[PDB]
């Protein structure tokens, strides 16, 4: 990544890199997804491809592809590991409410905490150290909010205050809007490099046709592969990720 | 009731560790020793030292100690995350043994195309009245350590919040001697009695003096998204390779 | 006796995350008209930028603006982002006409060459602790005219530049890019529109400026800078002096240095 | 033209991690003699601490100390820990005899009540690090002009790591009715520093520090020079912000003098 790209990833929490994969490559990726099973993730009008690398050698190798790994290296700067690799296929009336955010809250029963160390990032001696980054590979054009554009709360990756708990305001900000909520439009083939510290989601998709992407999650070698945990287990051997406040919790 | 007091949290924050005296009684200690003598050990690579690799696996006693509330309660107060047990091991040491310095907030690591100076496994922070340290140990001592010749725990003052690397420079000059042996202006010792726990932010640069006259068990905790402790040489070409890759330690140079 | 938070949780969130906050309609049209009429009575200086007039020290020149500088409607939000014993560091006015512009300045990690090069300016280095922001240098901009399009010379800022860890301007100069980003554009350069009577509360760590003004009519604002009591009142300083008694502010890279 | 770093890698490491640095033998015995002689010919004031005399403004009072304040043996290490365009903020002297003491002051996270709120950062001493450089806005060079080799000489003391403390220390002690200074009672992380005449102690004012009670005969003597950025005002004590917000000075957070 160039100095300007590093500046932009640092200051905004993400980076769009245009035309990483060519038209030939893109259609090849579309083909494989058509020939692959999906699940209901409990999100309306949304089909998920749960584990792309363990479902297809096309995506098992994309996960290790150099166009992805190299910019990821430049923002993680740790010995690297694959944490996850999934696909999303969306139709009209689907939506992805806000999640992420550097200072959102979590009640741990006896106490309330406001840092999630899995996304807590820093900077030292000319290098970014972000522990959890996604490479989003868009396989369809998203050029207006009604295409279900990616959206993000500006600067939320470095926020010191929690946003969502005070609102719980049962309407999502991706629908109602927010003064610092901005949209990002992408072309098929583009890659969005994302600091998972960013509070982000997508607008509601109102257009017809399929919205398609493949998401790959990376972190240091001492991170576990991604897995949802309701809470820490009684015998302290339960592994996984316990999310702080997200809009799904009250919208 | 908070596990750690105001003063205790202040001390852990400012020094990187906390000795809590008399956590486990005579009988408990004797029990722990008795169980240790039962169990197999491996050659950990350090002379006059035997390592009990996976105590919770090899013994129900230490499977139970690892979850003891007297360890978990203070550990919670400095991790403040959903918790996982990352490791649990024992160390038995005789005269002539030594543990060189390791840890350090800003020690270096060569990755292959770049040099990095943060280890996120030990990178800690503070937010709204709470410490957030990702990798902490509860060291449970099973023998008295009251002098440097007992092989006392020692640490580099403030090294858990260091912004500069210390060890690479020493090696570049060719200082083959360990600071635990030679001394260092800010290297200090800690003395404990058996049954005490030393609660340790792993970001701290620490080791032990050489023993001349030694029983402890160590339990490592972190967030639920950390993998259980395993030594890793480098990232695999597979990126499925899991483990912890340490930055500079004295063992690499001494 | 009946204190109410000057800033809401959401307002603090926005100021923290973006480095500024627009507070709408702080001053009603009557007060705005009063401020305008008072500026009409005052003289200006040439600040070295074309089509710009500066009212150099408004609290010294006017009881109206001396009062404004201390108005609780400005001080109360300022206290919520500085959170130190307070000092007024400057108070000035700007009147701009067509073809005037204000190049980018500020930024958290811009460079300064001293036998060494440094990348922090401690006058704008800010932090957060136990539920409170601590920003050492903040401005309250009171707009006395409507700025509703870029062509009105809108305030613009580089997104997240108040917490930037990398320098932006030194490299653009090295690459010979000698036109301002406010004219050329930049991917994360964004505009802010305001109405007369609005206040823009600004962390001076933010890299900001304005677009070039193309429209008719006077663009008018008054700006008040605040910091801790141990900060000196604002004065430009070229370099530390030989005797180490020189006081003032030595800015890091700004676009004016090479555009 | 032939610049070598004022501070070594190790010296920077130590200053960063401990909040201070003792630089031995910076000034020779003859120079120390020159400084002592000059102080004897200058007037003091009563600073309001028992058995303590203060020379309030040495660089104004005498060209010798004006020159000392600008000596590169002080300025070069100061520059390496401030890393800003520099200004001299104060220069004073302290002469102490037996039964004198200096209670703890400083500390990164001590509290200050401001009427409608309590704050826990003092931006005059809030310091950071970036790209290989320390940025500490308020540092002192203490030039010792006598030997201090035991606690009863009134040794400098400090709370370990207090320059980077995230919690306050003094307020809770006061609330728990502990009105005995830690320099008298001790504290688990309170440490002492011994110095020789001619040594310089370079000090991050974020560090919580003071001295032990002096019991010994012979004057305890030093001169202190305070430096920070050009936009800092010269040091002046200030109780509160002023009515017109034009008042300049430094409003300290909790110090032991408030409680003990
Ligand atoms: C009832 N299950 C929900 C329980 C919530 N506590 C989770 O935060 C939520 O999960 C989140 O959902 C939001 C939408 O509301 C996004 O889908 C987030 O994106 C996810 O899940 C995130 O983020 C994860 C991690 N970034 C955070 O653990 C992984 O990357 C996953 O692949 C990814 O779908 C689950 O859906
Ligand atoms: C040849 N193998 C060595 C490879 C080095 N790169 C390691 O850093 C070193 O490992 C370290 O050894 C030092 C002694 O020189 C301490 O023993 C450290 O303490 C250890 O290993 C640490 O720290 C680990 C983690 N804290 C860091 O990975 C785990 O807790 C281990 O169980 C624990 O013994 C290994 O021995
Ligand atoms: C030769 N004169 C220029 C010398 C540069 N080194 C200054 O940075 C520049 O000063 C800056 O100019 C830009 C425009 O190019 C803005 O005007 C900045 O805004 C200023 O000057 C700032 O910022 C100052 C402080 N924020 C920074 O010291 C004060 O607020 C001033 O009132 C305010 O005009 C001067 O004009
Ligand atoms: C009733 N007057 C006291 C009021 C307190 N609020 C001050 O904190 C205290 O001032 C402090 O006193 C302690 C002793 O209790 C040390 O002397 C500190 O050191 C001082 O005063 C500091 O620190 C100042 C700055 N470091 C902080 O403002 C300057 O360096 C001074 O020259 C220096 O004496 C005054 O004495
Ligand atoms: O669909 C997008 O553009 C973003 C997807 C996302 O944020 C996620 O899957 O976590
Ligand atoms: O032996 C001790 O006292 C501490 C042991 C230790 O530091 C370790 O094994 O990591
Ligand atoms: O004119 C504006 O809108 C902002 C002016 C500004 O940034 C300044 O005066 O420094
Ligand atoms: O007397 C000393 O050794 C230190 C004095 C000091 O800390 C001060 O003057 O603020
Ligand atoms: Ni997401
Ligand atoms: Ni260890
Ligand atoms: Ni400006
Ligand atoms: Ni002092």
DSSP letter string, chain B: --SS-HHHHHHHHHHSEEEE-S-S-HHHHHHHHHHHHHS--B--SSTTEEEETTHHHH-HHHHHHTT-HHHHHHHHHHH-S-EEEEEEEEEEE-TT--EEEE--TT--EE-SS-EE---TTS--EEETTEEE-S-EEEEEE-S-B-STTBT-EEEETTGGG-SS--HHHHHHHT--S-HHHH--TTEEEE-B-TT-EEEEETTS-EEEPPB---EEEEEEEEETTBPPP-B-SS--TTS---SB-----GGGT-
Q: Find chain D residues with C-beta within 8 A of C109's C-beta.
A: 130
Give the separation between CA C81 and CA C13, rounded to whole angstroms: 11
Tell which residue, C249, C230, B127, has the closest CA to residue D123. C230
* Nearby residues of B30 by Cβ (< 8 Å), 6 or more positions away: none
Which H/E stretch holds residue D23? strand D20-23
Experimental method: X-ray
Give the angle A196-A199-A202 at the CA atoms, nearest 5°: 100
Tell which residue, A72, A84, A64, has the closest CA to residue A226. A84
Class of domain C1-259: mainly beta
C258 C-beta neighbours (distance < 10 Å), count: 16
As for chain D, the residues directly before each break of C–N over 2.5 Å are none
Q: Are D235 and D227 in contact (CB under 8 A)?
A: no
Phi, psi at D5, each rounded to 5°: -55, 135
Tell which residue, B119, B94, B132, B112, has the closest CA to residue B221. B132
Q: Are B134 and B121 in contact (CB under 8 A)?
A: yes
Q: Are A173 and A115 in contact (CB under 8 A)?
A: no
User: Which is the closest atom of ligand 5 to the Cα of A194?
Assistant: 7
Burial call D150-175: b when 16+ CB within 10 Å, e when fewer: ebebbbbbbbbbbbbbbbbbbbebee
Fill in the DSSP letter of residue D235: P
Phi, psi at A16, each rounded to 5°: -90, 125
Give the separation between CA C86 and CA C70, rounded to whole angstroms: 11
Give the separation between CA A126 and CA A77, rounded to whole angstroms: 11
Tell which residue, B212, B202, B88, has the closest CA to residue B145. B212
CA-CA distances (angstroms) from residue A225 to A80, A118, A233, B225, D115? 12, 12, 17, 8, 50
Give the separation between CA C180 and CA C169, rounded to whole angstroms: 10
Q: Are C157 and C19 in contact (CB under 8 A)?
A: yes
A122 C-beta neighbours (distance < 10 Å), count: 14
Give the angle B202-B205-B207 at the CA atoms, nearest 5°: 95
Fill in the DSSP letter of residue D233: P
* Nearby residues of D184 by Cβ (< 8 Å), 6 or more positions away: D101, D213
Give the angle A177-A180-A182 at the CA atoms, nearest 5°: 75
Q: Find chain C residues with C-beta within 8 A of A128's C-beta.
A: 165
Q: Find chain D residues with C-beta within 8 A of B164's C-beta.
A: 9, 12-13, 16
* Nearby residues of A153 by Cβ (< 8 Å), 6 or more positions away: A98, A101, A159, A163, A173, A178, A180, A181, A198, A199, A200, C17
Fill in the DSSP letter of residue D33: H
Q: In C, what residues contact B, Cβ < 8 A?
A: 130-131
* Nearby residues of A34 by Cβ (< 8 Å), 6 or more positions away: none
- B225, B228, B234, best to mutate vs chain A, most A CBs in 10 Å: B225
By the 10 Å C-beta count (0-12 exposed, 13-18 middle, 19+ buried), B231 is classed as exposed
CA-CA distances (angstroms) from residue D199 to D26, D143, D202? 6, 6, 10
Q: Are B110 and B117 in contact (CB under 8 A)?
A: no
- B7, B8, B14, B189, best to mutate vs chain D, most D CBs in 10 Å: B14
Residue nearest to atom 29 of ligand 4 (CA): D235
Which ligand has the nearest atom to the CA of B217? 6
Which H/E stretch holds residue D130? strand D128-130
Q: Are C99 and C155 in contact (CB under 8 A)?
A: no
* Nearby residues of A238 by Cβ (< 8 Å), 6 or more positions away: A229, A232, B84, B224
H, E, C per residue of chain A: CCHHHHHHHHHHCEEEECCCCCHHHHHHHHHHHHCCCCECCCCCCEEEECCCCCCCHHHHHHCCCHHHHHHHHHHHCCCEEEEEEEEEEECCCCCEEEECCCCCCEECCCCEECCCCCCCCEEECCEEECCCEEEEEECCCECCCCECCEEEECCHHHCCCCCHHHHCCCCCHHHHCCCCEEEECECCCCEEEEECCCCEEECCECCCCCEEEEEEEEEECCECCCCECCCCCCCCCCCCECCCCCHHHCC
- CATH number given to D1-260: 2.60.120.620
C-alpha Rg value of chain C to the nearest Å: 18
- CB–CB of A81 and B121 under 8 A? no
CA-CA distances (angstroms) from residue B83 to A238, A241, B138, D68? 9, 11, 14, 56
Q: Are D240 and D105 in contact (CB under 8 A)?
A: no
Give the separation between CA B204 and CA B102, rounded to whole angstroms: 8
CA-CA distances (angstroms) from residue B111 to A80, B102, B114, B118, C97? 10, 18, 6, 12, 56
C-alpha Rg value of chain A to the nearest Å: 18
Residue from A228, A231, A239, A251 to probe ligand 1 pocket by mutation (most atoms less than 8 Å from CB): A228
Give the separation between CA D54 and CA A59, rounded to whole angstroms: 75
Q: Domain ranges for chain B, please list them.
A: 1-254
Cite the annotated binding site of D for Fe(2+) by residue number: 105, 205, 209
CA-CA distances (angstroms) from residue B139 to A74, B100, D257? 36, 17, 38
Q: First-to-last CA distance in chain C?
A: 52
Q: Distance of alpha carbon D136 from its chain centroid, rounded?
A: 13
Give the separation between CA B89 and CA B54, rounded to whole angstroms: 5
* Nearby residues of C136 by Cβ (< 8 Å), 6 or more positions away: C82, C84, C122, C123, C124, C125, C126, C227, C228, C231, D123
Q: First-to-last CA distance in chain B?
A: 45
Class of domain A1-251: mainly beta
Residue from D212, D224, D226 to probe ligand 8 pocket by mutation (most atoms less than 8 Å from CB): D224
* Nearby residues of C53 by Cβ (< 8 Å), 6 or more positions away: C44, C45, C46, C47, C94, C95, C96
Cite the annotated binding site of B for succinate by residue number: 89, 141, 214
Give the separation between CA C13 and CA A162, rounded to whole angstroms: 8
- C10, C11, C16, C17, best to mutate vs chain A, most A CBs in 10 Å: C17
Q: Which residue of chain D is at minimal alpha-carbon distance from C119?
A: D130
Tell which residue, B17, B228, B206, has the closest CA to residue B121. B228
By the 10 Å C-beta count (0-12 exposed, 13-18 middle, 19+ buried), B20 is classed as middle
Fill in the DSSP letter of residue D228: E
Q: Find chain B residues with C-beta within 8 A of D207's C-beta.
A: none
Give the separation between CA B221 and CA B224, rounded to whole angstroms: 9
Give the angle B222-A121-C131 at the CA atoms, nearest 5°: 90
Write down the H helix ranges in chain D. Answer: 9-18, 29-40, 58-61, 63-69, 72-82, 170-175, 182-185
Q: Are A15 and A8 in contact (CB under 8 A)?
A: yes
Q: Are B208 and B180 in contact (CB under 8 A)?
A: yes
Ligand 9 centroid to residue A213 C-alpha, Å: 12
Give the separation between CA C69 and CA D245, rounded to whole angstroms: 9
Q: Which residue of chain A is at minimal alpha-carbon distance from D128?
A: A124
- HSE-CB of C246 using CA atoms within 13 angstroms: 16
Give the angle A195-A200-A206 at the CA atoms, nearest 5°: 135
Phi-psi region of D245 (alpha: psi -120 to 50; beta: other; left: phi over 0): left
Fill in the DSSP letter of residue D234: P
Ligand 6 centroid to residue C148 C-alpha, Å: 64
Give the separation between CA A240 and CA B83, rounded to whole angstroms: 10
Header resolution in angstroms: 1.6
Phi, psi at A181, each rounded to 5°: -85, 115
Ligand 3 pocket member C251 (CB < 6 A): yes
Tell which residue, C206, C96, C105, C103, has the closest CA to residue C147. C96
Phi-psi region of D97 (alpha: psi -120 to 50; beta: other; left: phi over 0): beta
Give the separation between CA D121 and CA C85, rounded to whole angstroms: 11
Give the separation between CA C241 and CA D1, rounded to whole angstroms: 20
Instruction: Looking at the complex, report in whole angstroms how far the Cα of residue A129 sits from the nearest Cα belonging to chain D.
Output: 14
Across-strand partners of D88?
D227
DSSP chain C: -----SS-HHHHHHHHHHSEEEETTSS-HHHHHHHHHHHHTS--B--SSTTEEEE--HHHH-HHHHHHTT-HHHHHHHHHHH-SSEEEEEEEEEEE-TT--EEEE--TT--EE---EE---TTT--EEETTEEE-S-EEEEEE-S-B-STTBT-EEEETTGGG-SS--HHHHHHTT--S-HHHH--TTEEEE-B-TT-EEEEETTS-EEEPPB-SSS-EEEEEEEEEETTBPPP-B-SS--TTS---SB-----GGGT-
Q: Distance of alpha carbon B14 from its chain centroid, rounded?
A: 17
Fill in the DSSP letter of residue D151: G
Give the separation between CA C187 and CA A7, rounded to whole angstroms: 11
* Nearby residues of A90 by Cβ (< 8 Å), 6 or more positions away: A45, A46, A47, A148, A205, A210, A211, A212
Give the separation between CA A216 and CA A193, rounded to whole angstroms: 10
What fold characterizes domain B1-254?
Answer: Jelly Rolls (2.60.120)
Phi, psi at C82, each rounded to 5°: -95, -50
D4 C-beta neighbours (distance < 10 Å), count: 6
User: Which is the closest atom of ligand 1 to the Cα of A41?
Assistant: 36
Give the separation between CA D252 and CA D258, rounded to whole angstroms: 10
Q: Are C206 and C147 in contact (CB under 8 A)?
A: no
Q: Distance of alpha carbon B120 from its chain centroid, rounded?
A: 16
CA-CA distances (angstroms) from residue D34 to C90, D28, D71, D224, D225? 44, 10, 15, 16, 17
* Nearby residues of D246 by Cβ (< 8 Å), 6 or more positions away: C87, C88
* Nearby residues of A181 by Cβ (< 8 Å), 6 or more positions away: A151, A152, A153, A154, A173, A174
- CB–CB of D18 and B158 under 8 A? yes
- Biggest alpha carbon–alpha carbon distance for chain B: 54
* Nearby residues of B3 by Cβ (< 8 Å), 6 or more positions away: B73, B74, B76, B77
Fill in the DSSP letter of residue D164: G
Give the separation between CA D209 and CA D192, rounded to whole angstroms: 10
Q: Quick one: CA torsion of A128, A129, A133, A136, rounded to 10 degrees?
A: 20
- CB–CB of D161 and B13 under 8 A? yes
- The edge-to-edge listing of strands for the beta sheet with B17-20 is B17-20, B197-201, B136-141, B215-223, B83-93, B49-52
């Amino acid at each position: 990544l160039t100095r300007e790209q590093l500046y932009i990833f640092d200051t905004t929490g993400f980076l769009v890199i245009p035309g990483v994969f060519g038209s030939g490559e893109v259609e090849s990726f579309r083909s494989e997804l058509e020939r692959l099973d999906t699940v209901d993730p409990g999100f309306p009008r949304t089909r998920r491809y749960p584990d792309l690398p363990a479902a297809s050698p096309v995506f098992a190798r994309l996960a290790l592809d150099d166009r992805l790994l190299a910019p990821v290296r430049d923002v993680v700067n740790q010995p690297l590991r694959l944490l996850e690799g999934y696909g999303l296929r969306r139709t009209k009336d689907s939506v992805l409410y806000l999640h992420g955010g550097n200072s959102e809250l979590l009640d741990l029963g006896d106490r309330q905490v406001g840092r999630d160390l899995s996304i807590t990032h820093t900077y030292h001696d000319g290098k970014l150290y972000c522990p959890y980054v996604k490479a989003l590979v868009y396989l369809s054009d998203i050029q207006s909010p009604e295409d279900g554009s990616f959206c993000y709360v500006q600067g939320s990756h470095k926020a010191n205050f929690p946003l969502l708990r005070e609102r719980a305001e049962n309407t999502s900000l991706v629908d109602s809007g927010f003064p610092t909520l901005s949209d990002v439009f992408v072309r098929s083939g583009d890659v969005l490099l994302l600091n998972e510290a960013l509070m982000h989601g997508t607008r509601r998709k109102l257009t017809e046709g399929d919205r398609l992407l493949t998401a790959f999650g990376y972190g240091p070698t001492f991170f576990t592969e991604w897995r949802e945990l309701d809470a820490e287990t009684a015998d302290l051997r339960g592994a996984g990720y316990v999310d702080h406040d997200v809009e799904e919790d009250f919208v």
